[PDB]
Amino acid sequence: DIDLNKLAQRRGKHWFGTAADIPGTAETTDAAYLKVLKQNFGEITPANAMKFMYTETEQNVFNFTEGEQFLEVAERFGSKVRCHNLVWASQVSDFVTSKTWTAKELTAVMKNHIFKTVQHFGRRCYSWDVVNEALNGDGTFSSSVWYDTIGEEYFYLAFKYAQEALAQIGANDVKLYYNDYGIENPGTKSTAVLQLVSNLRKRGIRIDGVGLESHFIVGETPSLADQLATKQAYIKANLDVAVTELDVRFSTVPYYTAAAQKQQAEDYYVSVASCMNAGPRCIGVVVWDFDDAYSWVPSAFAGQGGACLFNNTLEAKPAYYAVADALEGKPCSVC
Ligand SMILES: *[C@@H]1O[C@H](CO)[C@@H](O[C@@H]2O[C@H](CO)[C@@H](O[C@@H]3O[C@H](CO[C@@H]4O[C@H](CO)[C@@H](O)[C@H](O)[C@@H]4O)[C@@H](O)[C@H](O[C@@H]4O[C@H](CO)[C@@H](O)[C@H](O)[C@@H]4O)[C@@H]3O)[C@H](O)[C@H]2NC(C)=O)[C@H](O)[C@H]1NC(C)=O
Ligand SMILES: *[C@@H]1O[C@H](CO)[C@@H](O)[C@H](O)[C@H]1NC(C)=O
After folding, report:
1. Which residue of 15, 28, 73, 235 pairs with 43 in a disulfide if CB–CB is 3.0 to 4.6 A?
2. Which is it for the CA torsion 322, 243, 246, 220, positive or negative?
3. CB 122 within 8 A of CB 171
């Protein structure tokens, strides 16, 4: 037996984690899936259950049933939870997107959502992904109902409100993260993250960490050196770093040949190793689910897939064993 989380913890990390799409999908009652989940992970992110559209479906009407169902699974397994997410362009309730708003009114909507959601779960959340995917690749703000109506201030206010809501209930230890893709290597987007952090902190607003989604493509994964350098840039700026949504997807079939799987193993390996080699402030690695049969990829991109550590019948791939090697600080044995 290998237990990825056990290995990660032996080498200074908080956990090895995964997203799980519970209670939204058949994972919820898939015993084989749940057995691998319990056996390998010390953190679980809700893939959907804490999102705006599953927490506040009508204005100021909160129903946390899905999130509570998710948390019982995670907590029963002894796993920490990266709560995800408060403010994002996608998966916002219809009452928000299908109504017209002033900046003042939508600011209040945002504030009320943050306070009620953060205070409901309280310290059961290790952290929150407060704002999700706020940047374009060029470092400008990306479009969302929030940005388009409120302007740039929405971003700073989201963190201010999360901080205030947690302070009110004595939960200052719940960490506040910004989470995005395309910020795992050097470039304009990463630089823009650092600027956002600087701007938050000048306003006396707490930001504890950055979440590096790490939705990579097999054969096009940024190098160990580049990923390590970028993590060090964040850490040197007094940010904790988590790899939050790691997967390495194939742009085309085949997904399961020897050469394909070796490349994918190497891509997972360097991504994990970059966190190991960054030291303790890279707190851990979370994959965006671990079973190809439940992966987000094929429904997002026609013909892409095979992105996860385990295949559809829950056989561990070379990438699983490569991650285990990385977590132990050992050379890749299957690359
Ligand atoms: C996880 O689950 C997936 C499925 O979801 C499994 O994926 C399968 O993995 C197999 C083993 O790697 C793949 O089969 C091999 O395919 C090779 C390429 O074959 C093709 O040529 C045929 C015939 O014209 C075409 O149909 C194909 O499209 C390709 O052009 C074969 O060369 C290979 O066959 C050889 O013969 C013996 C059997 O007598 C093999 O044992 C030997 O290894 C040798 O290579 C073989 O059939 C299969 O394609 C693949 N399925 C898909 C849809 O990709 C994984 O194995 C599971 N496990 C893991 C860890 O991922
Ligand atoms: C809350 O959501 C749960 C989870 O889907 C659902 O079953 C139920 O209809 C909702 N409860 C209330 C009181 O609106």
Report:
1. 15
2. negative
3. yes
Name the residue at shortest CA distance from atom 10 of ligand 2: 63
User: Closest Cα to atom 14, ligand 2: which residue?
Assistant: 63
CATH number at 241 reads: 3.20.20.80
* Number of domains making up the chain: 1
Query: How far, in Å, from the CA of 73 to the mean position of ligand 2?
Result: 18
Q: Cα angle vertex 3, ends 81, 246, to 5°?
A: 55
Quick check: 86 and 129 in contact, CB under 8 A? yes
Name the residue with the closest Cα to ligand 2, atom 13: 63
Pairing relation of β-strands 61-62 and 56-58?
antiparallel
The reported resolution of this PDB entry, expressed in Å, is 1.5
What is the identity of the amino acid at 250?
F
Q: How many CA atoms lie within 13 A of 128 on its CB side?
A: 34
Report helix, strand or coil for 5. Answer: helix
Q: Which of 238, 167, 143, 158 is nearest to 203 (CA)?
A: 158
Note whether 18 and 43 are within 8 A (CB).
yes
Using CA atoms, how far apart are residues 271 and 284, in angstroms rounded to an integer?
11
Calpha distance 92→170 (Å, rounded): 28
Burial annotation 16-38 (CB, 10 A radius, 16+ → b, else e): bbbbbbbbbbebeebeebbebbe
Tokens read off for 144: 């969302």
- Beta bridge partners, 132, equal 179
Ligand with an atom nearest the CA of residue 68: 2
CA distance 115 to 251: 40
User: 207: domain range?
Assistant: 1-335
Q: Diameter of the chain by CA atoms?
A: 57
- Sort 86 into a burial class: Cβ within 10 Å, 0-12 / 13-18 / 19+: buried
Structure-determination technique: X-ray
What is the distance in A from the centroid of ligand 2 to the CA of 26?
Answer: 18
Other CB atoms within a 10 A radius of the CB of residue 224 amount to 17
Nearest by Cα to 288 from 216, 189, 225: 216
